[PDB]
Design a protein around this ligand. Sequence first.
Ligand SMILES: [Zn+2]
Ligand SMILES: [Zn+2]
Lengths: 36, 36
Amino acid sequence: GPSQPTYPGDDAPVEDLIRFYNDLQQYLNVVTRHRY
Amino acid sequence: GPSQPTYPGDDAPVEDLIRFYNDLQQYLNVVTRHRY
Ligand SMILES: [Zn+2]
Ligand SMILES: [Zn+2]
């Protein structure tokens, strides 16, 4: 599956936290075998 | 709004990454003024 996303840091702009959130969602969906 | 969640670390168990994901979602919804 996808490799584990890198956390962009506490001080990242909101746009980058949103990007990380989306990548983390995808990662967790694959790890849990639930790609919906 | 809620304070910014603390990242639990790359090596956290999946359950804790899910918990962080949910807390981050709530945080981002409030920051973007879109609590749906
Ligand atoms: Zn892979
Ligand atoms: Zn507050």
